[PDB]
């Protein structure tokens, strides 16, 4: 009928609020959405959103001069992947001790906060919050 | 055999919620841990919770680790390996130096700093298993 049972595969509609503690022994799956694009200067950003967290991965290669503090203007991050607060995504350049960060502001117009750079392989995975 | 709006209860079966769910208390998923020395003195400590692994880098670099080299003392066990390669950015104590370690689906971690033979690598974060 319309009641939830303690056995069986079932579908449950409606907003369910659990006021106590919940334990899940199996998997807990939320839908995922993805996006990727070349932000600018050869740098690729790939995103996977699940709930209120976005998992990022930095790809590509720096193939043109990217000025210090500059906007990455080839692609903006779409609104559905944009954070409420500006976030600083730390990455690292292959082969040395050099780190950088790319900011993802609420507008999705990303910015490079390393020094002026024109070569190298930028990498880094991590997360930022969304709402 | 019905779920009630009160009481401590066990619920079996695959349950699909088509709407929104709120949990005011804690939400607990199964957890598993592992730690090992990947190579060159570097330790990686992991805790898996659902589809996310929490990591912490430890130990001290104690031998020459070549740039882009595989860390061959211990691989990350299959149950902690990601579907997609992850790049974990760490920092060396006492200076401005950063590195990253990749974890591929094989679990054979790879060092992406320059050739190094000393220092204390640290860093805590997460990576997904998909």
């Amino acid at each position: 009928g319309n009641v939830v049972h303690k056995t069986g595969d079932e579908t449950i509609a409606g907003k369910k609020t659990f006021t106590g503690n919940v334990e899940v022994n199996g998997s807990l799956t939320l839908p995922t959405k993805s996006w990727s694009g070349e932000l600018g200067g050869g740098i690729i950003l790939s995103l996977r959103k699940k709930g209120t967290t976005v998992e990022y991965s930095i790809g590509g290669e720096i193939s043109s001069s990217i000025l210090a503090n500059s906007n990455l203007v080839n692609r903006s991050v779409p609104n559905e992947f944009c954070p409420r607060n500006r976030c600083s995504l730390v990455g690292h350049m292959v082969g040395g001790w050099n780190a950088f960060h790319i900011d993802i502001p609420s507008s999705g117009v990303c910015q490079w906060f390393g020094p002026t750079a024109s070569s190298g392989t930028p990498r880094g995975t991590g997360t930022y919050p969304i709402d | 055999n019905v779920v009630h709006k009160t009481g401590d209860e066990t619920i079996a079966g695959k349950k699909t919620f088509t709407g929104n769910v709120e949990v005011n208390g804690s939400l607990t998923l199964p957890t598993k841990s592992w730690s090992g020395e990947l190579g060159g003195g570097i330790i990686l400590s992991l805790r898996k919770k659902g589809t996310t692994v929490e990591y912490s880098i430890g130990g001290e670099i104690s031998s020459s680790i070549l740039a882009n080299s595989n860390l061959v003392n211990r691989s990350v066990p299959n149950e902690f390996c990601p579907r997609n390669r992850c790049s974990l950015v760490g920092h060396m104590v006492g200076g401005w130096n950063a590195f990253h370690i990749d974890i591929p689906s094989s679990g054979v971690c790879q060092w992406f700093g320059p050739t190094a033979s000393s220092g204390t690598p640290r860093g805590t974060g997460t990576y997904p298993i998909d």
Epitope: G37, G59, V94, T121 | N68, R83, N84, R85
Partner: nanobody, 122 residues
Framework: QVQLVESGGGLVQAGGSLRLSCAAS????????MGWFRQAPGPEREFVAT????????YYRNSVKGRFTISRDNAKNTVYLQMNNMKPEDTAVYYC????????????????WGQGTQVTVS
């Protein structure tokens, strides 16, 4: 796991066109991003162009943009590299690779490889 077989290499003169093909032995081909690499400076294999699983995203080395096109036909388990306005700098052994993500540009970021096909410009 995939087996990759390249074809189409050969002699072409400067300004000419040549199309390379790389066929995967199984329909699982559509689960992989594909990349073309070459040993142009040599011996390092440098990426040339990459393509995502569905063909939705492509990425090219700057020196080949507007000259090369990477494409795939998932119904035929094949990836292609169309090379137009060929230059002496394009003379190289070209390799097809399969991996999980088109945004990767390094050899170790790919998992499966073709045999390599020689392309000679002039």
């Amino acid at each position: 796991q995939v087996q990759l077989v390249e074809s189409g290499g050969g002699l072409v003169q400067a300004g000419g066109s040549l199309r390379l093909s790389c066929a995967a032995s199984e329909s699982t081909f559509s689960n992989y991003a594909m990349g073309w690499f070459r040993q142009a400076p040599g011996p390092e294999r440098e990426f040339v162009a990459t393509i995502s699983q569905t063909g939705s995203h492509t990425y090219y080395r700057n020196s080949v943009k507007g000259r090369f096109t990477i494409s795939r036909d998932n119904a035929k388990n094949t990836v292609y590299l169309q090379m137009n306005n060929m230059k002496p700098e394009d003379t190289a052994v070209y390799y097809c690779a399969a991996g999980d993500n088109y945004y990767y540009t390094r050899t170790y970021e790919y998992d499966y490889w073709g045999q390599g096909t020689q392309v000679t410009v002039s």
